[PDB]
Each structure stands twice: as C-alpha cells, then as structure tokens.
Amino acid sequence: VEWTDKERSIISDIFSHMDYDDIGPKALSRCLIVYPWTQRHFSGFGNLYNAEAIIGNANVAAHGIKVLHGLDRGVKNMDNIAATYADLSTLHSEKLHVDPDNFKLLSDCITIVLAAKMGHAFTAETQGAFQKFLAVVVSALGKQYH
C-alpha cells in the first residue's frame, strides 16, 4: 500500500497523544455494546449481559488496551503491515475463529472513541488518514483466513 507523508505525521502523531488505557477499554467495551455479537468469544471474561456490566468488566479493560497496542507494529510496519500482521490474522482465524467482519466493526468503535477524545482535533483529514490505516491492518488481519 501507498502512504503520503502527511498520512504519516497525523498517523504518527495519533499514537503520540493517544491515551492507551483510556480509549482501549472505551472501544472494545464500546464494540460489544453497539455490536454485541462480538461477545461471541469473550464469553469467559465475566459478566457482560448488560451495557455497564461491560464497562464494568476489567478484562475487557485490559484486553481493550491489548488491542490498542496491537496496531503499534503496523505504525512501524506501514509498508509491510500484512507481512507484519500475517501471524496475527492466522491466530484469530484458526485458534480464535473470530469472524473477520468484526475486526472492521471494532475499528469504527476505535475511530469514534478517538473522535470524542480529539474533539475538534479529529478533523476530516485525520479521520481520513486514521481510517486509511485501520482499514489496512484489518485487511492483513483477514489476509490469512483460508
């Protein structure tokens, strides 16, 4: 994939200020609420039946940070994300079994969250370059679903 330089500052920037322990729990917890089918795997995490019992699940807290950091490498491996995410994908596919449509649904939960944290700072601009990075990881994230 291609990559402007301004796609690179904004994206680079976006991991400078990004609150990892703030938005991390705020986006997986947000995933399992707007798209509760995503709780399909996390079934052992404890109570998740109703909304704030999900915002009240520490495991999702934890993991949501996991997830967040999991896009770290990609920022490093921008021109090699697929080769870089190849084994993540394969993991989620054969061991985990996660339906790859959900990957794309968490992204929009990650996006959105960042959106209220950056407020007037998450411009069209930044949304463009931000999405145009998660939409590559996800890809790679799916690339080994055979």
Binding site: I33, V34, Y35, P36, W37, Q39, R40, S93, H97, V98, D99, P100, D101, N102, L105, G142, Y145, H146
Partner: protein, 142 residues
C-alpha cells in the same frame, strides 16, 4: 419492505422450486464456505465443514425450510422469524453481515437450477424478501 407484487412474485416462485428446497440449501451452504471460506469460523466444530458433506448438506435442509417458514410468514417475518432471531443472536451469535453472503449464494444456486423461472422480476422481489429475512434475523441482536 415488500409490496404486494413482491409477495405474489416471491410466493408464486416458491411454488415452482419449493420441491428443490432441500438440495438448494446444501448447494447454497456449500457455495457459502467455498467462495467465502471465512464464514467457516462458526462451523469450525464440524469435522466436515466442506462442500456438500453430511453436516453441511444435512444443515442445508434446516436452512431452506428456514427460508420456507419465512416465505410463508412474509407478511410478518419479524413475528415469523423471531425464534430464529433468538437462535442466531443469543446462541450462535452470527454477524448479520454474513446473511447477505448467504442470500447471494442462494440467488446464484437458484439461477443455476431454475434459469427460466428466476427472472429479473423474480430477482428484485426475491432480493427484497431476502433482505427482509435478514433484518428479522437481526431483530433482537442489539
């Protein structure tokens, strides 16, 4: 939303191919995980999740009849399918985005079976209904 035309249109074709409703599903269920072998995630507990096998084929029936039930209760797929909605939403929590894929392979298989009945006119109507069947399934998801 399905107009009247549609109901007729649909219904009036179910007539024709309802006898092949069994075989149609094992074939649509097969084309689902062939071209889209990532929907195999839910089925992963089936040793033979492969084109037209014992599980895949046997299931084919209990999905096409599922399309039977719908075609009947077309005037109210939400009431008619509500029990399925529990099934796919509170049990085998199936991402709704996958129902489109399935429909897709259900159109293709019916074309390849009834290339004369499946007209464009029975295409738009069947299509609408299929989407219809999807939304109901997604009744109680969230």
């Amino acid at each position: 939303s399905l107009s009247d035309k549609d109901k007729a249109a649909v219904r009036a074709l179910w007539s024709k191919i309802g006898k092949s409703a069994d075989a149609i599903g094992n074939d649509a269920l097969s084309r689902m995980i062939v071209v889209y072998p990532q929907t195999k995630t839910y089925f992963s507990h089936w040793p033979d999740v492969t084109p037209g096998s014992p599980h895949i084929k046997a299931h084919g029936k209990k999905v096409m009849g599922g399309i039977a039930l719908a075609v009947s209760k077309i005037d109210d797929l939400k009431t008619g399918l509500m029990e399925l909605s529990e099934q796919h939403a509170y049990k085998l929590r199936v991402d709704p985005a996958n129902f489109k894929i399935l429909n897709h392979c259900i159109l293709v298989v019916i074309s390849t079976m009834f290339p004369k009945e499946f007209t464009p006119e029975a295409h738009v109507s069947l299509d609408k209904f299929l989407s219809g069947v999807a939304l109901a399934l997604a009744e109680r998801y969230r």
